[PDB]
Design a protein around this ligand. Structure first.
Ligand SMILES: *Cc1c(COP(=O)(O)O)cnc(C)c1O
Ligand SMILES: *Cc1c(COP(=O)(O)O)cnc(C)c1O
Lengths: 396, 396
């Protein structure tokens, strides 16, 4: 039966990686990475998760299955991170959390739950958004539509085009929002814009689905949850898919969570039972290890203190590389106005480079970036900054 | 939107567990467990996986994402376990393995791949089979049909009814087989019956899907792969979903594998690229920890020796409890012919008890079993055997 099966295309980032490893040039730089790197170009395992793992190794007596929704403490901890410690949502028990295999797993169980149990047929995603949002919802049988977001010219959130396009969504459609550090632009709504968006949302009957994968990378943990909290104070119902891959450096342990919120506990438990049915029809119950590590760190004052400090160090290194980039470009001299890079949040930004400019950056200089000009700032170190900027000036 | 969502029913085994924990009686026994227990009623983490985990903790430098299909060594090792070390399938490179979140995850990516990429519309599953086979295939949009398997009266594989029912399957239908230790009956095809089944299968054009979750529990690792190997020698194409949850005691780490086989390497790579597309649309890439442990044990002579011995100890404890059961029933005296228990493989068997008999076993004696009379032999210890058999004799 697999005789006339057509091949799936190569997925871009692991397309560039092969081209990069197959490059003999000495000062080659890969900016199309999708992961965080430190000054040495490594993606280390954090000291707090190493300490949490030594603890688990000494204390685990069984590898018996977790419940469908994973481990209770993990659920408690992501709800408090998401909604704040004294949240009404938590005290009225309007929210339930299922531990999933990463943020993508959270998005897929949400998609299956929605397609099986409600009448949602379309999901609105931003233009641009990073990337397999489409196949996750389309495999579940949901149509994905795009709303406008970025203004190429100004390197800004084109808010008018955003609400204008979003007004074609009907009541009962899902609208996907990035909680903070919008991938790939790094442009986030201001708190007032989040509030007007929340108000518009209830009036139109949109079901909000928040994709939260970079909490802690823009300003700080509570600050980054602010927009979601603007929506949760307004909405009877919402779904948030969060990831711990980037802020805990636990990429390959597949730790994420899907939180359901609705008007009261009675409807959260009934809706959640069907989300659990969706999980058993997929992977049955979630991988314990990455989640055990997150629950151990977040419930322990000492370990959490070390992790929070490790997260601000990541945030601050990203903020410094964004400054150093704009300044070394300024200094290497050409016609800069990369000042917008200073103003965007997270690891990603559109550099403003054309497809042909990234193409000769690769061929002539060994600087690797994706064809859209998207750049991961964590690929920049103080050491490679000046050859990087030299290359960019030479292709402008 | 979650306002008129109906609740999903309680899933039976975690229905009994609540009833069991809520039972105040001293000598209560739970035989409806689904997991292995040792003499002390514990599901321990094996010494070899503890040793492998200490190694990983000392040696891991990154938690960066694994590839879509997981870690290469894991793939190499399950293919050699499945097909034998000098298999033609391996040397002609006709098989590709993706590491998945457990055996259920393997079944679901197979289901999605099949429904998205081929014309299979129905999957034939045995009557009985254990349990959510149906929802995994039905969520993917595949129809599930049943073929006859067990003979209630004789406590045997009713082979005639099996091939007779299976002859309504059309060419291009998938037929699901349990590789060894058929859950829930413990009745397996004899090697000759596997061979006649393999021959019939190619002639009819069935696509075989093997569910292999108990390798090592019936007779030994190679011996249990024998039937699959009868089919692989006959077939150009097949899929095998295997689990390491039970034979490595790694239940909650979600380690399994989905192996694709087709006529040559060129079609395995094209078919496999679409299986990888199915994975990214679901959880993106697999949890490293459980699989790292399995790859570390299987590639290391010392650690593998310890694990193999730990697996035969599990196998042998199950074999002893099956003997002790038949004998203590014989000895407690009533009208036995539970001799078939000695002849079935794995942790499960149908005791032959009626729904009302299991109901009063629970109410009057605190012995908990599922309504079908299915019993997990690993719930029996030399200590609880005589109260167990006493209870069964009293309800006969
Ligand atoms: C990283 C990311 C995800 C996926 O998180 P995983 O845990 O790696 O699956 C989802 N959405 C966005 C926007 C992300 O950046
Ligand atoms: C245990 C089992 C599975 C599932 O294995 P997991 O790794 O726990 O998901 C699938 N099929 C059968 C017959 C099983 O016994």
């Amino acid at each position: 039966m697999f005789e006339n099966i057509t091949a799936a295309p190569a997925d871009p980032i692991l397309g560039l990686a092969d081209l990069f490893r197959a490059d003999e040039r000495p000062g080659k730089i890969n900016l199309g990475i999708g992961v965080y790197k430190d000054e040495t170009g490594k993606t280390p395992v954090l000291t707090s998760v190493k300490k949490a793992e030594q603890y688990l190794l000494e204390n685990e007596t069984t590898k018996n299955y977790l419940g469908i929704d994973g481990i209770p403490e993990f659920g408690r901890c992501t709800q408090e991170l998401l909604f704040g410690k004294g949240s009404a949502l938590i005290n009225d028990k309007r929210a339930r959390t299922a531990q999933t295999p990463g943020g993508t797993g959270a998005l897929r169980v949400a998609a299956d739950f929605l397609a099986k149990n409600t009448s949602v047929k379309r999901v609105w995603v931003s233009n641009p958004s990073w990337p397999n949002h489409k196949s996750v919802f389309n495999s579940a049988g949901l149509e994905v539509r795009e709303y406008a977001y970025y203004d190429a010219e100004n390197h800004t959130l084109d808010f008018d085009a955003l609400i204008n396009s979003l007004n074609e969504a009907q009541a009962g459609d899902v609208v996907l929002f990035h909680g903070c550090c919008h991938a790939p632009t790094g442009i986030d709504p201001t708190l007032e814009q989040w509030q007007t968006l929340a108000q518009l949302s209830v009036e139109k009957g949109w079901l909000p689905l928040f994709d939260f994968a970079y909490q802690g990378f823009a300003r700080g943990l509570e600050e980054d949850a602010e927009g979601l909290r603007a929506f949760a104070a307004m909405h009877k119902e919402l779904i948030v898919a969060s990831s711990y891959s980037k802020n805990f450096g636990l990429y390959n342990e597949r730790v994420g969570a899907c939180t359901l919120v609705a008007a009261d506990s009675e409807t959260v438990d009934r809706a959640f039972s069907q989300m659990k049915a969706a999980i058993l029809a997929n992977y049955s119950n979630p991988p314990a290890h990455g989640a055990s590590v997150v629950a151990t760190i977040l419930s322990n004052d000492a370990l959490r203190a070390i992790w929070e400090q490790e997260l601000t160090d990541m945030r601050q290194r990203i903020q410094r590389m964004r400054q150093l980039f704009v300044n070394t470009l300024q200094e290497k001299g050409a016609n800069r106005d990369f000042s917008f890079i200073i103003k965007q949040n997270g690891m990603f930004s559109f550099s403003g480079l054309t497809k042909e400019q990234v193409l000769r950056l690769r061929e002539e200089f060994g600087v690797y970036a994706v064809a859209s000009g998207r750049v991961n700032v964590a690929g920049m170190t103080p050491d490679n900054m000046a050859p990087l900027c030299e290359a960019i000036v030479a292709v402008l």
